[PDB]
């Protein structure tokens, strides 16, 4: 089945197939005082193999492209990351030393460097607006809005109709919005619209932090930021 939190110890990371020639990698961090799991993606490109967000952190980072190397062997060249939090930047800076090209939003590469976590080297053009999409190795990079930053990203597999929703999509079991700094609740729930809208034939969902899921998601994420308003 999916690897659950309490599985990973911290450090350790995990690769879990989706579709063909396409994983997700799960680790876990602590924040304050807790051990959360996080979610990321991995896609082939070619010969080579692009990266959809770190693990959490530089030690943990480091365990995923060891992994990658022993389980699918083909080099990580590229990584995207989904926006400026240390789950999605953490470890940049190890990519970069590993020979990895690393690539990011402008918003994002401005917001990482205020918040003073890692800041990924390449900008990436032309996702600036609401809608707007470039499209990326073999996957499409689509930004919809402000959500759970109001530069978060996210990423479909056109091949596999595998769709990555980063931080901005919660999971089932996970039905407390909680920490919400730096998100814009006012736009969140247009934006998931916009994602139902772009990529409705997605077969395969995947949130920032649980197990993946459907469009299902999607739907449990605005009524969870919904009653995060009336209550
Ligand atoms: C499960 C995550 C709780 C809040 N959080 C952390 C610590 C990192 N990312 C998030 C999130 O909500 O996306
Ligand atoms: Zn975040
Ligand atoms: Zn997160």
């Known amino acids: 089945e999916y690897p659950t939190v309490s599985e990973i110890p911290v450090g350790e990371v995990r ?5 063909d020639g396409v994983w997700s990698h799960i680790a876990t961090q602590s924040f304050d005082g807790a051990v959360y799991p996080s979610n990321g993606l991995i896609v082939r490109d070619g010969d ?3 990266l959809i967000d770190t693990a959490w952190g530089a030690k943990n980072t480091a365990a995923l492209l060891a992994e990658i190397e022993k389980q699918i062997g083909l080099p990580v060249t ?14 940049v800076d190890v990519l970069r030393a ?7 939003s402008p918003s994002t590469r401005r917001l990482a460097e205020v918040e003073g976590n890692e800041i990924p080297t390449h900008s990436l053009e032309g996702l600036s607006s609401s809608g707007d999409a470039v499209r ?3 996957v499409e990079l689509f930004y919809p809005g402000a959500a759970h930053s109001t530069d978060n990203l996210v990423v479909y597999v056109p091949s596999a109709s595998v769709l990555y929703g980063g931080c901005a999509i919660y999971e089932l079991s996970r039905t407390s919005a909680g920490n919400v700094a730096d998100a814009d609740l006012a736009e ?3 934006s998931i619209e916009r994602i139902q809208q772009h990529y409705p034939e997605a077969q395969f969902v995947i949130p920032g932090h649980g197990l993946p899921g459907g469009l299902d998601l999607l739907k449990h994420t605005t009524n969870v930021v ?4 009336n209550r």
């Open 188 to 190: 969140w729930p247009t």
């Open 48 to 50: 080579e193999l692009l």
């Open 226 to 229: 919904k009653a995060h308003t």
């Open 98 to 104: 590993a020979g990895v090209a690393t690539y990011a």
């Open 78 to 91: 590229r990584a995207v990351s989904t926006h400026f939090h240390d789950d999605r930047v953490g470890g």
């Open 15 to 19: 690769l879990y197939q989706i579709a």
């Open 136 to 138: 990326f190795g073999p």
